[PDB]
Design brief:
Organism: Homo sapiens (Human)
Number of strands: 26
Structural class: alpha/beta
Bound molecules: 2-acetamido-2-deoxy-beta-D-glucopyranose
CATH topology of the largest domain: Rossmann fold
Subcellular location: Endoplasmic reticulum membrane; Golgi apparatus membrane
Distance between the termini: 49 Å
Strand order of the largest sheet: 8-9-7-11-12-13-14
Largest sheet: 7 strands, parallel
Number of domains: 3
Family: Belongs to the peptidase S8 family.
Radius of gyration: 24 Å
Protein name: Membrane-bound transcription factor site-1 protease
Number of helices: 11
Subunit structure: Interacts with LYSET; this interaction bridges GNPTAB to MBTPS1.
CATH architecture of the largest domain: 3-Layer(aba) Sandwich
Protein backbone atom coordinates (compact mmCIF):
# COMPACT_ATOMS: atom_id res chain seq x y z
CA UNK A 1 0.00 0.00 0.00
CA UNK A 2 2.62 2.53 1.13
CA UNK A 3 6.16 2.35 -0.26
CA UNK A 4 9.03 4.48 1.03
CA UNK A 5 11.91 4.86 -1.41
CA UNK A 6 14.62 7.53 -1.34
CA UNK A 7 17.03 9.42 -3.55
CA UNK A 8 19.68 12.01 -2.75
CA UNK A 9 22.02 14.46 -4.44
CA UNK A 10 24.73 16.97 -3.63
CA UNK A 11 23.95 20.63 -4.26
CA UNK A 12 26.79 22.28 -6.17
CA UNK A 13 29.12 24.63 -4.29
CA UNK A 14 27.35 24.32 -0.92
CA UNK A 15 29.18 22.76 2.00
CA UNK A 16 28.44 21.81 5.54
CA UNK A 17 31.30 23.13 7.64
CA UNK A 18 31.38 20.96 10.73
CA UNK A 19 33.21 22.55 13.64
CA UNK A 20 35.20 21.07 16.48
CA UNK A 21 32.57 22.56 18.77
CA UNK A 22 29.54 24.76 19.24
CA UNK A 23 30.00 28.35 18.04
CA UNK A 24 28.16 31.64 17.65
CA UNK A 25 27.48 32.88 14.13
CA UNK A 26 30.25 35.48 14.00
CA UNK A 27 32.87 33.04 15.31
CA UNK A 28 32.02 30.55 12.58
CA UNK A 29 32.18 33.34 9.99
CA UNK A 30 35.56 34.55 11.29
CA UNK A 31 37.12 31.07 11.36
CA UNK A 32 36.00 30.52 7.79
CA UNK A 33 37.22 33.98 6.72
CA UNK A 34 40.65 33.58 8.27
CA UNK A 35 41.03 30.11 6.76
CA UNK A 36 40.10 31.75 3.48
CA UNK A 37 42.63 34.53 4.11
CA UNK A 38 45.45 32.01 4.22
CA UNK A 39 43.84 30.65 1.04
CA UNK A 40 43.72 32.25 -2.41
CA UNK A 41 39.98 31.60 -2.93
CA UNK A 42 37.88 34.78 -2.82
CA UNK A 43 34.52 33.77 -4.32
CA UNK A 44 32.82 32.47 -1.20
CA UNK A 45 29.83 33.38 0.94
CA UNK A 46 27.94 32.08 3.91
CA UNK A 47 24.44 30.92 2.96
CA UNK A 48 22.69 31.79 6.24
CA UNK A 49 19.78 29.98 7.85
CA UNK A 50 16.41 31.21 9.16
CA UNK A 51 14.85 28.79 11.60
CA UNK A 52 14.35 28.10 15.34
CA UNK A 53 17.99 27.00 15.62
CA UNK A 54 19.36 30.28 14.20
CA UNK A 55 18.95 31.76 17.68
CA UNK A 56 21.49 29.31 19.05
CA UNK A 57 25.23 28.70 18.75
CA UNK A 58 25.86 26.08 16.14
CA UNK A 59 28.40 23.38 15.34
CA UNK A 60 28.10 23.87 11.58
CA UNK A 61 27.74 26.44 8.83
CA UNK A 62 26.59 26.39 5.21
CA UNK A 63 28.90 28.14 2.77
CA UNK A 64 29.25 28.43 -0.98
CA UNK A 65 32.44 28.22 -3.05
CA UNK A 66 32.66 28.58 -6.83
CA UNK A 67 36.22 29.58 -7.76
CA UNK A 68 38.50 26.76 -6.49
CA UNK A 69 36.87 24.37 -4.05
CA UNK A 70 39.66 21.88 -3.37
CA UNK A 71 42.07 24.50 -2.05
CA UNK A 72 39.22 26.08 -0.09
CA UNK A 73 38.09 22.89 1.61
CA UNK A 74 41.69 21.75 2.19
CA UNK A 75 42.49 25.07 3.85
CA UNK A 76 39.30 25.05 5.92
CA UNK A 77 39.89 21.47 7.07
CA UNK A 78 43.42 22.54 8.04
CA UNK A 79 41.92 25.25 10.23
CA UNK A 80 42.21 24.15 13.87
CA UNK A 81 38.56 24.69 14.86
CA UNK A 82 37.10 23.23 11.66
CA UNK A 83 36.51 19.50 12.11
CA UNK A 84 35.30 18.53 8.64
CA UNK A 85 33.76 19.96 5.51
CA UNK A 86 31.21 17.85 3.64
CA UNK A 87 28.88 18.76 0.76
CA UNK A 88 25.25 19.76 1.25
CA UNK A 89 22.83 17.01 0.23
CA UNK A 90 19.20 17.04 -0.94
CA UNK A 91 16.96 14.06 -0.08
CA UNK A 92 13.57 13.08 -1.50
CA UNK A 93 11.38 10.78 0.63
CA UNK A 94 9.20 8.97 -1.92
CA UNK A 95 5.91 8.03 -0.31
CA UNK A 96 4.18 5.64 -2.70
CA UNK A 97 -8.33 -2.93 14.33
CA UNK A 98 -7.56 -0.92 17.43
CA UNK A 99 -3.85 -1.60 17.04
CA UNK A 100 -2.96 -0.22 20.48
CA UNK A 101 -5.63 -2.62 21.84
CA UNK A 102 -4.62 -5.45 19.50
CA UNK A 103 -1.31 -4.99 21.37
CA UNK A 104 -3.25 -4.66 24.66
CA UNK A 105 -2.17 -1.08 25.33
CA UNK A 106 -5.61 -0.99 26.95
CA UNK A 107 -4.09 -2.89 29.88
CA UNK A 108 -1.45 -0.19 30.23
CA UNK A 109 -4.08 2.54 29.80
CA UNK A 110 -6.11 0.65 32.40
CA UNK A 111 -3.19 0.84 34.86
CA UNK A 112 -2.87 4.57 34.17
CA UNK A 113 -0.08 4.63 31.57
CA UNK A 114 -0.99 6.77 28.57
CA UNK A 115 2.23 8.60 27.63
CA UNK A 116 2.26 11.50 30.08
CA UNK A 117 5.38 13.66 30.24
CA UNK A 118 7.13 11.82 27.41
CA UNK A 119 8.32 14.14 24.65
CA UNK A 120 8.04 12.29 21.36
CA UNK A 121 8.95 14.05 18.13
CA UNK A 122 7.90 13.38 14.56
CA UNK A 123 10.37 14.27 11.81
CA UNK A 124 7.83 14.47 9.03
CA UNK A 125 5.67 16.89 7.00
CA UNK A 126 3.97 18.65 9.92
CA UNK A 127 0.58 18.64 11.61
CA UNK A 128 -2.31 20.99 10.87
CA UNK A 129 -3.01 23.60 13.51
CA UNK A 130 -6.63 22.64 14.12
CA UNK A 131 -6.53 18.84 14.35
CA UNK A 132 -8.97 17.46 16.97
CA UNK A 133 -7.31 14.04 17.51
CA UNK A 134 -4.51 15.49 19.65
CA UNK A 135 -4.47 17.25 23.00
CA UNK A 136 -0.85 18.05 23.89
CA UNK A 137 0.96 19.41 20.86
CA UNK A 138 3.67 21.57 22.41
CA UNK A 139 5.26 23.01 19.26
CA UNK A 140 5.32 22.87 15.45
CA UNK A 141 8.78 24.27 14.67
CA UNK A 142 9.64 24.40 10.99
CA UNK A 143 12.91 23.77 9.15
CA UNK A 144 11.91 23.87 5.48
CA UNK A 145 11.92 26.83 3.13
CA UNK A 146 8.14 26.44 2.73
CA UNK A 147 6.16 28.72 5.05
CA UNK A 148 3.75 26.16 6.49
CA UNK A 149 3.62 24.25 9.78
CA UNK A 150 0.61 22.15 8.67
CA UNK A 151 0.55 18.74 6.98
CA UNK A 152 -0.18 18.65 3.25
CA UNK A 153 -0.19 14.87 2.67
CA UNK A 154 -0.77 13.35 6.13
CA UNK A 155 2.17 11.00 6.79
CA UNK A 156 3.17 13.12 9.76
CA UNK A 157 -0.47 13.18 10.87
CA UNK A 158 -0.71 9.39 10.56
CA UNK A 159 2.49 8.95 12.61
CA UNK A 160 1.42 11.40 15.30
CA UNK A 161 -1.98 9.73 15.48
CA UNK A 162 -0.58 6.23 15.94
CA UNK A 163 1.71 7.55 18.67
CA UNK A 164 -0.99 9.68 20.27
CA UNK A 165 -4.68 10.15 19.54
CA UNK A 166 -8.00 10.12 21.29
CA UNK A 167 -10.51 9.45 18.52
CA UNK A 168 -11.83 6.94 15.98
CA UNK A 169 -8.21 5.85 15.49
CA UNK A 170 -6.67 5.46 18.92
CA UNK A 171 -2.99 6.24 19.30
CA UNK A 172 -0.64 4.26 21.49
CA UNK A 173 -0.02 7.18 23.89
CA UNK A 174 -2.89 9.68 24.35
CA UNK A 175 -1.19 12.02 26.82
CA UNK A 176 2.20 12.35 25.08
CA UNK A 177 3.79 15.78 24.67
CA UNK A 178 4.00 16.11 20.90
CA UNK A 179 6.70 17.99 18.98
CA UNK A 180 6.22 18.39 15.26
CA UNK A 181 9.35 18.87 13.14
CA UNK A 182 8.31 19.76 9.61
CA UNK A 183 11.59 18.61 8.08
CA UNK A 184 10.12 17.68 4.69
CA UNK A 185 8.44 20.01 2.26
CA UNK A 186 4.98 19.32 0.92
CA UNK A 187 7.03 17.74 -1.88
CA UNK A 188 8.98 15.48 0.53
CA UNK A 189 12.31 17.28 0.04
CA UNK A 190 14.85 17.94 2.76
CA UNK A 191 18.51 18.90 3.23
CA UNK A 192 21.23 17.69 5.55
CA UNK A 193 21.43 21.20 6.99
CA UNK A 194 17.67 21.13 7.67
CA UNK A 195 18.04 17.79 9.42
CA UNK A 196 21.11 18.98 11.33
CA UNK A 197 19.42 22.18 12.54
CA UNK A 198 16.32 20.16 13.45
CA UNK A 199 18.40 17.51 15.28
CA UNK A 200 20.17 20.28 17.17
CA UNK A 201 16.84 21.71 18.24
CA UNK A 202 15.66 18.19 19.15
CA UNK A 203 18.75 17.94 21.38
CA UNK A 204 17.94 21.33 22.89
CA UNK A 205 14.30 20.26 23.36
CA UNK A 206 15.43 16.96 24.95
CA UNK A 207 13.04 14.77 23.01
CA UNK A 208 12.73 11.31 24.58
CA UNK A 209 11.49 9.42 21.50
CA UNK A 210 12.13 10.31 17.86
CA UNK A 211 10.39 8.63 14.97
CA UNK A 212 12.70 9.09 12.00
CA UNK A 213 11.78 8.43 8.39
CA UNK A 214 15.00 9.43 6.63
CA UNK A 215 17.24 6.97 4.85
CA UNK A 216 19.40 6.56 1.78
CA UNK A 217 23.02 5.40 1.67
CA UNK A 218 24.55 8.76 0.72
CA UNK A 219 22.42 11.04 2.88
CA UNK A 220 23.39 9.30 6.17
CA UNK A 221 26.84 10.80 5.80
CA UNK A 222 29.50 11.85 8.29
CA UNK A 223 27.76 14.93 9.77
CA UNK A 224 24.42 13.09 9.66
CA UNK A 225 25.65 9.89 11.32
CA UNK A 226 27.66 11.89 13.86
CA UNK A 227 24.58 13.93 14.76
CA UNK A 228 22.60 10.67 15.08
CA UNK A 229 25.25 9.31 17.46
CA UNK A 230 25.11 12.59 19.36
CA UNK A 231 21.30 12.35 19.72
CA UNK A 232 21.49 8.73 20.91
CA UNK A 233 24.29 9.88 23.20
CA UNK A 234 21.99 12.61 24.51
CA UNK A 235 19.41 9.93 25.43
CA UNK A 236 17.26 10.25 22.31
CA UNK A 237 15.65 6.84 21.93
CA UNK A 238 15.34 6.75 18.16
CA UNK A 239 12.91 4.54 16.26
CA UNK A 240 13.14 4.04 12.53
CA UNK A 241 12.17 1.54 9.87
CA UNK A 242 14.73 -0.74 8.24
CA UNK A 243 13.28 -0.16 4.77
CA UNK A 244 19.82 5.27 11.08
CA UNK A 245 17.67 2.20 11.83
CA UNK A 246 20.31 -0.19 10.44
CA UNK A 247 22.91 1.51 12.62
CA UNK A 248 24.10 0.13 15.95
CA UNK A 249 22.36 2.73 18.10
CA UNK A 250 18.83 3.01 16.67
CA UNK A 251 15.89 0.68 17.27
CA UNK A 252 15.30 -0.75 13.81
CA UNK A 253 11.81 -2.07 13.13
CA UNK A 254 10.41 -4.55 10.63
CA UNK A 255 6.84 -5.22 9.58
CA UNK A 256 4.46 -8.17 9.94
CA UNK A 257 0.74 -8.36 9.34
CA UNK A 258 -2.00 -9.14 11.85
CA UNK A 259 -1.65 -12.88 11.18
CA UNK A 260 2.06 -12.49 12.12
CA UNK A 261 3.28 -13.05 8.55
CA UNK A 262 6.23 -11.30 6.93
CA UNK A 263 4.81 -8.80 4.44
CA UNK A 264 5.90 -8.57 0.81
CA UNK A 265 7.00 -4.97 1.35
CA UNK A 266 9.16 -6.17 4.26
CA UNK A 267 26.61 -8.44 8.98
CA UNK A 268 24.93 -7.62 12.27
CA UNK A 269 21.29 -8.68 12.60
CA UNK A 270 18.66 -6.04 11.79
CA UNK A 271 15.76 -5.38 12.40
CA UNK A 272 15.85 -5.51 16.17
CA UNK A 273 12.17 -6.53 16.27
CA UNK A 274 8.99 -6.53 14.20
CA UNK A 275 5.39 -5.45 14.79
CA UNK A 276 2.21 -4.85 12.80
CA UNK A 277 2.68 -2.68 9.73
CA UNK A 278 -0.18 -3.80 7.48
CA UNK A 279 -3.73 -2.50 7.80
CA UNK A 280 -2.81 -0.07 10.57
CA UNK A 281 -5.09 2.92 11.03
CA UNK A 282 -4.29 6.49 12.01
CA UNK A 283 -5.46 10.07 11.98
CA UNK A 284 -6.54 11.94 8.88
CA UNK A 285 -4.98 15.26 7.89
CA UNK A 286 -7.82 17.33 9.39
CA UNK A 287 -9.76 14.42 10.84
CA UNK A 288 -10.93 10.94 10.13
CA UNK A 289 -9.13 7.64 9.90
CA UNK A 290 -7.20 5.82 7.23
CA UNK A 291 -5.31 2.56 6.86
CA UNK A 292 -1.78 2.14 5.48
CA UNK A 293 0.31 -0.98 4.82
CA UNK A 294 4.06 -0.58 4.43
CA UNK A 295 7.48 -0.68 6.02
CA UNK A 296 7.24 2.85 7.39
CA UNK A 297 4.05 1.91 9.25
CA UNK A 298 5.49 -0.40 11.92
CA UNK A 299 8.04 2.24 12.94
CA UNK A 300 5.36 4.56 14.40
CA UNK A 301 3.73 1.44 15.86
CA UNK A 302 6.92 0.73 17.81
CA UNK A 303 7.48 4.45 18.46
CA UNK A 304 4.06 4.73 20.07
CA UNK A 305 4.72 1.51 21.96
CA UNK A 306 8.05 2.93 23.22
CA UNK A 307 6.45 6.25 24.22
CA UNK A 308 3.90 4.31 26.25
CA UNK A 309 6.63 2.04 27.66
CA UNK A 310 8.60 5.13 28.76
CA UNK A 311 5.52 6.33 30.61
CA UNK A 312 5.24 2.86 32.22
CA UNK A 313 8.66 3.17 33.88
CA UNK A 314 8.74 4.54 37.43
CA UNK A 315 12.26 6.00 37.43
CA UNK A 316 13.14 7.48 34.04
CA UNK A 317 16.82 7.42 35.07
CA UNK A 318 16.97 3.83 33.78
CA UNK A 319 15.57 4.47 30.30
CA UNK A 320 18.14 4.91 27.56
CA UNK A 321 18.45 3.70 23.97
CA UNK A 322 20.22 0.50 25.07
CA UNK A 323 17.88 -0.55 27.89
CA UNK A 324 14.81 0.12 25.71
CA UNK A 325 16.34 -1.90 22.88
CA UNK A 326 17.15 -4.66 25.37
CA UNK A 327 13.53 -4.80 26.52
CA UNK A 328 12.15 -4.92 22.98
CA UNK A 329 14.42 -7.87 22.22
CA UNK A 330 14.11 -9.80 25.53
CA UNK A 331 10.31 -9.52 25.62
CA UNK A 332 10.09 -10.33 21.94
CA UNK A 333 8.10 -13.42 21.04
CA UNK A 334 9.90 -15.49 18.43
CA UNK A 335 8.09 -16.22 15.22
CA UNK A 336 8.47 -19.96 14.49
CA UNK A 337 10.09 -20.40 11.10
CA UNK A 338 11.50 -16.89 10.56
CA UNK A 339 15.26 -16.37 10.56
CA UNK A 340 17.07 -13.70 12.55
CA UNK A 341 17.48 -11.44 9.50
CA UNK A 342 13.74 -10.82 9.08
CA UNK A 343 12.29 -10.79 12.59
CA UNK A 344 15.24 -10.04 14.87
CA UNK A 345 14.44 -11.22 18.39
CA UNK A 346 10.71 -11.71 17.77
CA UNK A 347 7.62 -9.61 17.12
CA UNK A 348 6.89 -6.88 19.65
CA UNK A 349 5.15 -7.87 22.86
CA UNK A 350 4.02 -4.77 24.66
CA UNK A 351 2.99 -6.51 27.90
CA UNK A 352 6.12 -8.61 28.35
CA UNK A 353 8.18 -5.64 27.19
CA UNK A 354 6.48 -3.79 30.01
CA UNK A 355 7.30 -6.68 32.38
CA UNK A 356 11.02 -6.76 31.56
CA UNK A 357 11.26 -2.97 31.62
CA UNK A 358 9.59 -3.10 35.03
CA UNK A 359 12.19 -5.55 36.33
CA UNK A 360 15.15 -4.36 34.25
CA UNK A 361 18.58 -3.96 35.86
CA UNK A 362 21.43 -2.02 34.19
CA UNK A 363 23.68 -4.46 32.40
CA UNK A 364 25.32 -5.31 29.10
CA UNK A 365 23.82 -7.74 26.64
CA UNK A 366 24.60 -9.26 23.29
CA UNK A 367 22.63 -9.50 20.08
CA UNK A 368 22.43 -12.29 19.15
CA UNK A 369 22.52 -13.45 22.79
CA UNK A 370 23.94 -16.85 21.73
CA UNK A 371 25.41 -18.62 18.72
CA UNK A 372 24.03 -21.94 17.43
CA UNK A 373 24.98 -22.59 13.85
CA UNK A 374 22.79 -25.72 13.76
CA UNK A 375 19.57 -23.84 14.68
CA UNK A 376 17.79 -23.69 11.36
CA UNK A 377 16.02 -21.53 10.32
CA UNK A 378 16.59 -18.84 12.98
CA UNK A 379 20.38 -18.67 12.66
CA UNK A 380 20.41 -18.86 8.87
CA UNK A 381 22.62 -18.81 6.77
CA UNK A 382 25.03 -20.23 9.34
CA UNK A 383 22.99 -23.45 9.35
CA UNK A 384 23.17 -23.77 5.56
CA UNK A 385 26.29 -25.87 6.30
CA UNK A 386 28.51 -26.88 9.24
CA UNK A 387 32.04 -25.60 9.84
CA UNK A 388 34.84 -27.76 8.43
CA UNK A 389 38.52 -27.20 9.22
CA UNK A 390 40.22 -25.59 6.24
CA UNK A 391 37.31 -23.21 5.74
CA UNK A 392 37.26 -19.49 6.37
CA UNK A 393 36.40 -18.49 9.95
CA UNK A 394 32.73 -18.11 10.75
CA UNK A 395 32.37 -14.42 11.57
CA UNK A 396 29.46 -13.26 13.74
CA UNK A 397 29.35 -9.56 14.49
CA UNK A 398 27.71 -9.27 17.88
CA UNK A 399 26.21 -6.00 19.02
CA UNK A 400 26.92 -5.10 22.61
CA UNK A 401 24.18 -3.09 24.27
CA UNK A 402 25.60 -1.29 27.28
CA UNK A 403 22.61 -0.13 29.27
CA UNK A 404 25.07 0.87 31.97
CA UNK A 405 26.44 3.94 30.16
CA UNK A 406 26.87 5.89 26.98
CA UNK A 407 30.62 5.25 27.37
CA UNK A 408 32.02 1.84 28.26
CA UNK A 409 34.88 -0.56 27.49
CA UNK A 410 35.73 -4.22 27.09
CA UNK A 411 37.82 -4.79 30.20
CA UNK A 412 40.22 -7.17 28.44
CA UNK A 413 40.46 -9.69 25.64
CA UNK A 414 37.19 -11.68 25.50
CA UNK A 415 37.83 -15.25 26.63
CA UNK A 416 36.73 -18.27 24.62
CA UNK A 417 36.02 -21.14 27.07
CA UNK A 418 35.33 -24.51 25.40
CA UNK A 419 33.61 -27.41 27.14
CA UNK A 420 36.04 -30.33 27.25
CA UNK A 421 33.44 -33.13 27.65
CA UNK A 422 31.52 -31.63 24.72
CA UNK A 423 34.86 -31.24 22.88
CA UNK A 424 34.62 -27.49 22.54
CA UNK A 425 38.41 -27.68 22.08
CA UNK A 426 37.82 -28.63 18.45
CA UNK A 427 37.20 -24.96 17.63
CA UNK A 428 39.24 -21.81 18.07
CA UNK A 429 37.53 -18.42 17.90
CA UNK A 430 39.33 -15.08 17.55
CA UNK A 431 37.99 -11.65 18.46
CA UNK A 432 38.26 -8.52 16.33
CA UNK A 433 36.19 -6.00 18.22
CA UNK A 434 35.58 -2.31 18.85
CA UNK A 435 37.32 -1.50 22.12
CA UNK A 436 35.53 1.51 23.67
CA UNK A 437 31.72 1.37 23.56
CA UNK A 438 29.95 4.62 22.70
CA UNK A 439 27.15 5.60 22.60
CA UNK A 440 25.34 3.01 24.80
CA UNK A 441 26.73 0.23 22.59
CA UNK A 442 29.72 -1.40 20.95
CA UNK A 443 30.46 -4.48 18.92
CA UNK A 444 32.29 -7.81 19.17
CA UNK A 445 33.13 -9.73 16.01
CA UNK A 446 33.98 -13.41 16.55
CA UNK A 447 35.81 -15.54 13.96
CA UNK A 448 35.13 -19.24 14.57
CA UNK A 449 37.51 -21.87 13.23
CA UNK A 450 37.93 -25.56 13.96
CA UNK A 451 41.20 -26.67 15.53
CA UNK A 452 43.64 -29.18 14.11
CA UNK A 453 42.76 -32.21 16.25
CA UNK A 454 39.24 -32.19 14.73
CA UNK A 455 40.11 -32.01 11.05
CA UNK A 456 38.74 -35.55 10.67
CA UNK A 457 35.88 -35.32 13.17
CA UNK A 458 32.09 -35.07 13.06
CA UNK A 459 29.90 -33.84 15.89
CA UNK A 460 28.88 -30.92 18.07
CA UNK A 461 31.48 -28.79 19.81
CA UNK A 462 30.26 -26.34 22.39
CA UNK A 463 31.52 -23.61 24.65
CA UNK A 464 30.97 -20.02 25.65
CA UNK A 465 32.64 -16.62 25.55
CA UNK A 466 33.04 -14.65 28.78
CA UNK A 467 33.11 -10.99 27.79
CA UNK A 468 33.12 -8.21 30.36
CA UNK A 469 31.85 -4.69 29.72
CA UNK A 470 32.81 -1.88 32.07
CA UNK A 471 31.48 1.67 32.13
CA UNK A 472 31.86 4.43 34.70
CA UNK A 473 29.45 4.70 37.60
CA UNK A 474 26.23 6.38 36.47
CA UNK A 475 24.94 6.53 40.06
CA UNK A 476 32.70 5.09 42.54
CA UNK A 477 33.44 1.69 41.06
CA UNK A 478 33.10 0.92 37.38
CA UNK A 479 29.87 -0.75 36.33
CA UNK A 480 30.81 -4.22 35.15
CA UNK A 481 28.57 -6.81 33.56
CA UNK A 482 30.03 -10.09 32.36
CA UNK A 483 27.99 -11.74 29.62
CA UNK A 484 28.23 -15.40 28.66
CA UNK A 485 27.66 -16.06 24.97
CA UNK A 486 26.92 -19.77 24.46
CA UNK A 487 28.38 -21.08 21.22
CA UNK A 488 27.26 -24.31 19.55
CA UNK A 489 28.61 -25.59 16.26
CA UNK A 490 28.50 -28.75 14.20
CA UNK A 491 31.78 -29.82 12.58
CA UNK A 492 32.52 -32.23 9.74
CA UNK A 493 35.55 -33.62 7.93
CA UNK A 494 36.87 -31.32 5.22
C1 LIG B 1 31.15 -5.22 12.97
O1 LIG B 1 30.25 -4.14 12.67
C2 LIG B 1 30.85 -2.84 12.64
C3 LIG B 1 29.74 -1.86 12.34
O2 LIG B 1 29.53 -0.97 13.42
C4 LIG B 1 31.97 -2.80 11.61
O3 LIG B 1 32.60 -1.52 11.64
C5 LIG B 1 32.98 -3.90 11.90
O4 LIG B 1 33.97 -3.92 10.88
C6 LIG B 1 32.28 -5.25 11.95
N1 LIG B 1 33.23 -6.31 12.25
C7 LIG B 1 33.51 -7.30 11.40
C8 LIG B 1 34.53 -8.29 11.85
O5 LIG B 1 32.96 -7.39 10.30
Amino acid sequence: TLKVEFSSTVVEYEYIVAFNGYFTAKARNSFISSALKSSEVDNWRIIPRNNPSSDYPSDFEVIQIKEKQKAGLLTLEDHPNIKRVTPQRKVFRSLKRQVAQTLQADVLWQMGYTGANVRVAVFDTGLSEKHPHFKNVKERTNWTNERTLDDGLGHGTFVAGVIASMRECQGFAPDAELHIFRVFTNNQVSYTSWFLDAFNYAILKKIDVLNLSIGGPDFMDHPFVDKVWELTANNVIMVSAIGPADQMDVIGVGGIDFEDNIARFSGRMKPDIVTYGAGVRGSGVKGGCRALSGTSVASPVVAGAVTLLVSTVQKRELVNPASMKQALIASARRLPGVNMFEQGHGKLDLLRAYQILNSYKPQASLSPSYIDLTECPYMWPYCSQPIYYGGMPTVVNVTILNGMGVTGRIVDKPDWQPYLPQNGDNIEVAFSYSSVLWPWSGYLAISISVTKKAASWEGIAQGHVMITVASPAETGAEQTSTVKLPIKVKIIPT
